[PDB]
């Protein structure tokens, strides 16, 4: 069993936009989230790894994962204990990866087959369109884009201590909190989870280190389907939290990863 560090976050209304700064955002709260307990950190190479050795036998197929990265390479798996965020990872295998989670630790899978059981293999080409969500599974989940912004802005914690309304998550200045390109840089890498500061909810690396896949979806015309992903990385300066961007789930990239949900009842 892979041990989990997740932080209980708290329901409630709130607001979620692109305004920044000292206002009064219970007046504004535009949202309602029940609680949910969100992972901590980004989900590191050694936890990927060992959920796909794993689940290698029990039909679940978890593909690719890098070690963090160094420009737009790997790490070698072995650095700082495998503990960067994987990367390489796409939106698939993010799923795939959180069913496998729910199995282990015998909850239901949130992601299902049209048949109603649990995914475990990328659709074929065409087949995607009959994936369902089940809304009443108890299972690990990518967050929606409500509940991935009011996280990053500390909830209902933040909305006490002021700093809802930080421009990154926890800060409004983005070299204590974030692993993100700044002026003159030099080195674009990932850092091992964890290395900067944290925000009200105790969460780190939501701004920068690896973007985040949501379970967000993004319409548009054709065949292919379209998630968010959020919060920058160490390679791709953002504004604010509030920066995301989209891709095709089949992507993936050395500057995205992903951070799990799940209900609590
Ligand atoms: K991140």
Redesign the pocket.
């Known amino acids: 069993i892979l041990p989990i560090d997740e932080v209980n976050v708290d329901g409630g209304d709130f607001y979620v936009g692109l305004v920044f700064g000292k206002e009064d955002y219970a007046a504004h709260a535009n949202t309602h989230l029940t609680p949910f307990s969100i992972m901590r950190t980004?989900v590191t190479y050694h936890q990927y790894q060992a959920l796909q050795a794993w689940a290698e036998t029990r039909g679940y197929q978890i593909s690719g994962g890098c070690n963090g990265a160094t420009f737009e390479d790997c790490w070698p798996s072995e650095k700082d204990g495998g503990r960067h965020?994987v990367t390489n990872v796409s939106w698939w295998d993010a799923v795939i990866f959180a069913n496998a989670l729910s199995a282990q630790h015998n909850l239901q899978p949130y992601y299902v087959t049209a048949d109603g059981q649990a995914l475990k293999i990328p659709p074929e080409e065409g087949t995607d369109r009959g994936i369902r969500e089940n809304p009443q599974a108890s299972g690990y989940r990518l967050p929606t884009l409500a509940e991935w912004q009011v996280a990053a802005r500390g909830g209902n914690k933040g909305l006490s201590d002021g700093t809802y309304g930080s421009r990154y998550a926890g800060k409004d200045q983005p070299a204590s909190v974030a692993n993100l390109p700044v002026s003159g840089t030099q080195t674009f890498s990932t850092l091992p989870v964890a290395s900067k500061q944290p925000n009200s909810l105790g969460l780190y690396?939501?701004?920068?280190?690896?973007?985040?896949w949501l379970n967000e979806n993004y319409a548009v015309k054709g065949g292919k389907k379209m998630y968010y992903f959020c919060?920058?990385?160490y390679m791709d300066r953002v504004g604010s939290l509030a920066s995301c961007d989209v891709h095709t789930p089949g992507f993936a990239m050395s500057d995205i990863?992903f951070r799990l949900v799940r209900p609590i009842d």
């Not at 690396?205 to 985040?212: A, K, T």
């Open positions: 980004e965020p690396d939501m701004s920068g280190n690896v973007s985040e919060g920058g990385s990863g």
